[PDB]
Design a protein around this ligand. Structure first.
Ligand code: 137
Length: 264
């Protein structure tokens, strides 16, 4: 529905077709069976959150639709190592090329550089992309409720499980939340505080949904985390899992900014 999302998804269908033409599904499936074992993306968040410790998914993002270029000097392996040293639980690596100035290679490089699990941050609309995520070494994929009907969403999640990927489902409102909870049993329920129609950010997007989130799910609050008051708000509300990019991409030492926001 969101205009920018429609444009991304239209492009995404083209890119999938183009890649499938060059590398067909059977080959991507062979590469996925051969990849390094998944590192346990959900487990890494769950083991910290259950101890009331910050579970930070640190995001490697060169540019974005809402902000333009976020980091001039962009070396994924170095960002990954800084993130790990600063206390991140997992990484998020944008692999979308035309809207986030990302690349699949950035995920391979970030993952090889550290021992943390990595979510492929991209726009999944086709089982091909899910199998491909595992072939490039991802430990988790992203499903965006705004972008999917329920049957397709269940199908993509089932494809992910069958290649050993964890699933992060992202919602923006109560209607999307209830579709996600009814359709998927992943524990990882991501709430995006950034409205994709206006690009406005509200941390209360997360807080207002907590009364509908079962205790067997883990809330991952996404976007808008910029300062320590934001972190305090979430932790007092018993939100311990975060997806954060801009706050770190604007800093000289991204891992140090992570330590300053979460571990002092
Ligand atoms: O950030 C954007 O401009 C944007 C635009 C269109 C679609 C999705 C978008 N962002 C996806 C969102 O998951 C963010 O990359 C992460 O939540 C990290 O947010 P940040 O901490 O950088 O505000």
């Amino acid at each position: 529905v969101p205009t920018v999302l429609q444009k991304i998804l239209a492009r995404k269908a083209e890119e999938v077709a183009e890649r499938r033409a060059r590398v067909n599904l059977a080959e991507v499936e062979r590469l996925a069976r051969s990849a390094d074992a998944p590192r346990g993306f959900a487990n890494a968040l769950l083991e910290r959150a259950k101890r009331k410790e910050p579970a930070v998914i640190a995001e490697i993002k060169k540019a974005s639709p809402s902000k333009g270029v976020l980091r001039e000097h962009f070396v994924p392996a170095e960002i990954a190592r800084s993130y790990e040293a600063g206390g991140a639980a997992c990484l998020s690596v944008l692999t979308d090329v035309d809207f986030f100035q990302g690349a699949d290679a950035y995920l391979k490089e970030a993952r090889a550089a550290c021992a943390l699990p990595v979510i492929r941050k991209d726009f999944m609309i086709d089982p091909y992309q899910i199998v491909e995520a595992r072939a490039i070494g991802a430990d988790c994929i992203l499903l965006i409720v705004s972008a999917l009907d329920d049957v397709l969403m269940a199908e993509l999640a089932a494809t992910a499980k069958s290649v050993g990927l964890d699933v992060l489902v992202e919602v923006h409102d109560g209607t999307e939340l209830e579709r996600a909870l009814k359709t998927l049993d992943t524990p990882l329920v991501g709430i995006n505080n950034r409205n994709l129609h206006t690009f406005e950010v509200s941390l209360e997007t997360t807080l207002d949904l907590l009364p509908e989130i079962p205790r067997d799910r883990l809330v991952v609050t996404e976007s808008g985390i910029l300062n320590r008051a934001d972190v305090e708000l979430m932790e007092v509300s018993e939100v311990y899992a975060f997806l954060v990019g801009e706050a770190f991409m604007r800093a000289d030492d991204p891992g140090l900014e992570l330590k300053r926001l979460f571990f002092q």
